[PDB]
Amino acid sequence: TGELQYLKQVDDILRYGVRKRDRTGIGTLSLFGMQARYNLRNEFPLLTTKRVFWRAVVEELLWFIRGSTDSKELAAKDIHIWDIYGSSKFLNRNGFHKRHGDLGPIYGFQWRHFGAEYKDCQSNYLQQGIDQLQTVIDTIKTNPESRRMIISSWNPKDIPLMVLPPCHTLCQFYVANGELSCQVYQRSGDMGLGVPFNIAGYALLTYIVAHVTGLKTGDLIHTMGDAHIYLNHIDALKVQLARSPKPFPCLKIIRNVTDINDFKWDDFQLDGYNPHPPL
Amino acid sequence: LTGELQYLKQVDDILRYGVRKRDGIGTLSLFGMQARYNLRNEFPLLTTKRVFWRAVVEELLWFIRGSTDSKELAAKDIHIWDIYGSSKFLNRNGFHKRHTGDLGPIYGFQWRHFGAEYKDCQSNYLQQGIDQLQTVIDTIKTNPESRRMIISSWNPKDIPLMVLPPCHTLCQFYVANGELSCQVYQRSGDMGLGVPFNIAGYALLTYIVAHVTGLKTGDLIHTMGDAHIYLNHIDALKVQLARSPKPFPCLKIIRNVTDINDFKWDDFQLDGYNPHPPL
Questions:
Q1: What 3-state class would DSSP assign to B90?
Q2: Where are the domains of chain B?
Q3: How far B97 CA sits from the closest chain A CA (Å)?
Q4: In B154-173, which positions are buried (b, 16+ CB within 10 angstroms) versus exposed (e)?
Q5: Do B124 and B109 meet the contact criterion of CB atoms below 8 Å apart?
Q6: Which residues, including other chains, have CB under 8 Å from residue B214's CB and lie 6 or more apart?
Q7: How many helices (H) and strands (E) does chain A have?
Q8: Which of B22, B150, B157 sits opposite A169 (nearest CB)?
């Protein structure tokens, strides 16, 4: 059950799902404490039930990793998924003061820089805060077994300064028999979009540290907080589970990369991803 | 499938399928565990071995007003923290500037004051930091649906300044059908010792806030990171799984408490608890 964890997850949110209300006002079917374990050995968990956005996932992570916070830098990659928050209008009438596209101390600030006072995006924070992103790489061959290897996006004092609180709060890593495995806690998840993107995103994150640390890839545990389906997309999702999912792709890396920050989207070669066409 | 049984299978699975390690002390370990505990009309306090109830209650009350003092727990003859608050242990790692019974910002202080300046336990930090708790309490009354109700103990800011990194790293709450739920992240836990103890901790917290808010208690999802079983106890617990767990006891709260630490040991009446005997 590599692919079919997701599939019943969203049937369980239908049959047994509880009406709750979204923060937009649209009602959702809800469920708690979901748990999936995805297999990163000789496979990659890009779900073939619906075409995932692969460009966004990669270039968002490399945006997380480099310790960059901005709307432009993803925009510059022609990935506009965050650009709705960076705005003259969004920021300002959401009660923001001065800077003309900061996202606040969003993810990737809170990875490489933690507790660092936030002025604005492109003021460089090097040697500020605590860098979680790798204190783990530093940990991984220091003490491979450990309970300590964690990256926490939750910093509640900085959260009134973020444009949105982190939807995936944290991840922790684990080392057994020459293989790495990461569990990420997603406090809110959207089975439609949010989640399978998260599965791509965090699964990718291990694959990096895989050849970095010589370690193969064990597995990915995607743990959920509130898991939900929007009421509209039911009839649209119900056809999506009507589909027999097709086998998982493999991910490759051509460039041997020693530095966690030095990655970019042309490093990443995928093998055989053929999802189903939407409506 | 449910409750304490699900706690044996974790035990079951790890014994068979775990990973031999070091610490130091060897152990068998597995990663990414989750399970559910029904908080409706019974208290998931574990029956295959006796869990310390006044430890669990009094630790939390002392988490709740956030004070961290070994001296505060010890007079109540609950001392789990003396090993960590004693000046033979303090003076080992650089606590040479620290008083006996003092620990650090961990848990309670973080709950009640976050991002604050940690001075010492003789000092009263009210008017300072930010509180994760009473905000969470006050959210459920105003906007209960929010998926951003979260308390995480992980603050690499004060991590070097606490005796040990927090074992239970975060929780989340939930509201559906007037039933408040809670999901605890443990980064490490002992299937025989620490886990059952912190299953009955957050259980009670769910209950307290439920009571404080006026919502019923639905369910407790136990989320685990590395979950280990020491080879010190390896055999003694295979006869502990031989037993069939007895039904869960029933927590009641006597005095009506509008406030969160007004709570005292005496408010808690626990009916039906008959755990299995030593060995």
A1: helix
A2: 1-279
A3: 23
A4: bbbbbbeebbebbbbbbbbb
A5: no
A6: none
A7: 8, 9
A8: B150
Which residues, listed in sequence order, are joined to residue A38 by a DSSP beta bridge? A220
Give the type of residue at B103. Answer: L
Q: Around Cβ A243, how many Cβ atoms within 10 Å?
A: 13
Here the tokens at position B40 are 């409706």
Q: A68 — phi, psi (to 5°)?
A: -100, 130
| A-B contacts at Cβ under 8 angstroms | 117
DSSP assignment of B211-223: HHHT-EEEEEEEE
| DSSP state at residue B130 | B
Is A250 in a helix, a strand, or coil?
strand
Q: CA dist A160 to A94, A105, B112, Å? A: 11, 9, 17
**Residue A216: closest CA among A224, A207, A205:** A207
- Please give the structure tokens belonging to residue A28: 């959702």
Tokens representing B102 are 């003092």
Q: Residue A181 and residue B31: Cβ atoms within 8 Å?
A: yes
Method for this entry = X-ray
End-to-end CA distance of chain A: give it in Å, rounded: 27
Sort out which chain A residues have CB atoms less than 8 A from B23's CB and list them.
145
- Among B53, B44, B52, residue whose Cα is nearest residue B4: B44
At CA B108, angle to CA B104 and CA B113, rounded to 5?
A: 85
Q: Could A20 and B145 be called an inter-chain contact, meaning their C-beta atoms sit closer than 8 Å? A: yes
Closest Cβ–Cβ partner in A132, A145, A169 for B22: A145
Tell me how far apart the alpha carbons of residues A191 and A145 are, in angstroms, rounded to a whole number: 32
Tokens coding B159? 């991590």
Whether residue A192 contacts residue A229, with contact meaning beta carbons closer than 8 Å, is answered with yes
Q: In degrees rounded to 5, what are phi and psi of residue A103?
A: -95, -5
Inter-chain touch B115–A115, beta carbons under 8 Å: yes
Are the beta carbons of B184 and B171 closer than 8 angstroms?
Answer: yes
- Classify residue A129 as left (phi > 0), alpha (psi -120 to 50) or beta: left
Residue B32 to residue A37, Cβ atoms within 8 A: yes
Contact A121, A103 (CB under 8 A): yes
Any known ligand binding at B190? yes
DSSP string of A113-126, one letter each residue: -SSPPP--TTS--T
Q: At what angle do helices B53-64 and B194-213 cross, to 10 degrees?
A: 60
Annotated binding residue at B69?
A: no
Nearest Cα of chain A lies from the Cα of B121 at a distance, in angstroms, of 22
Fold of A1-279: Thymidylate Synthase; Chain A (3.30.572)
Q: What count of other Cβ atoms lies within 10 Å of the Cβ of residue B127?
A: 7
The amino acid occupying position A228 is: H
The DSSP 8-state label assigned to residue A260 in this structure reads: G
**How close is the nearest chain B Cα to the Cα of A279, in Å?**
30
Closest chain A CA to residue B129: A157
| DSSP characters over B193-242 | THHHHHHHHHHHHHHHHHHHHT-EEEEEEEEEEEEEEETTSTTTTTTTTT
Beta-carbon separation of B169 and A170 below 8 A: yes
State this model's resolution in angstroms. 3.1
**Identity of the residue in A135, A145, A181 whose CB atom sits nearest the CB atom of B21:** A145
